[PDB]
Design a protein around this ligand. Sequence first.
Ligand SMILES: Nc1ncnc2c1ncn2[C@@H]1O[C@H](CSCC[C@H](N)C(=O)O)[C@@H](O)[C@H]1O
Length: 262
Amino acid sequence: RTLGEVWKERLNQMTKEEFTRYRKEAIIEVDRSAAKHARKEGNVTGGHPVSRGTAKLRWLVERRFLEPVGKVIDLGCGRGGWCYYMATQKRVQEVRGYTKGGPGHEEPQLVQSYGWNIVTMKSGVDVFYRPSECCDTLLCDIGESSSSAEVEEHRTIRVLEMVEDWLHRGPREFCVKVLCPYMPKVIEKMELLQRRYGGGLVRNPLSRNSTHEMYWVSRASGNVVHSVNMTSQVLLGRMEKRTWKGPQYEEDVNLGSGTRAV
Ligand SMILES: Nc1ncnc2c1ncn2[C@@H]1O[C@H](CSCC[C@H](N)C(=O)O)[C@@H](O)[C@H]1O
């Protein structure tokens, strides 16, 4: 049994109240309050991000785990927090996103933060059937969670196979969400995917403890197994913390407004 597995066995035996407590413990969280009430007054020029997403992506680019350049393609962009954010990046001159859409899933939200003009979001597109395009930096935040790990291991290997095909950039940029990185199939796939496209797994501190996801980013490295086991330790440790502090709230990002020339 991998340490990630005991982590799932444990998680699933918790209660609603202990569950809801565990997930947001000691993690970093942004204050959505402002954006929430900006949406109501129909304020699409406040510079407010459309989701908790953008903030997650920023934390990553800001540590230099990647450097978004040229045409940007986003897989499963939902509201568009990764797209609106990229449109505020120096070397990015076009953002394109694709999402499921339809009942149950989100629909891209059209706002006017800094650079919106450069982004095009198309909904009603199931990425697992869509043939590949050319992009300088690719992104993907897909991974439908389940109470079963065998199931996560699959939905992941699928995504990974869906990604490797879009991977025909050059010494390019990418950030891809890995739903279940602890099951052997995903570790064998990663190990190999690493040998071809470099990069590495990264646990994003903005994630909730109720998920073992990690981000394979082009500008990172490190023995995969090692990378995923360290995290498991963390998630396992946050369950037995005698003293419980809630989540730490950092300020939510502000993209600005207006358009970017030409
Ligand atoms: N096959 C598929 N194709 C496209 N999007 C998919 C998909 N399966 C799941 N998704 C999408 O996965 C998204 C994960 S949420 C990602 C949120 C995004 N970074 C933001 O900032 O808003 C959901 O919005 C869902 O619609």
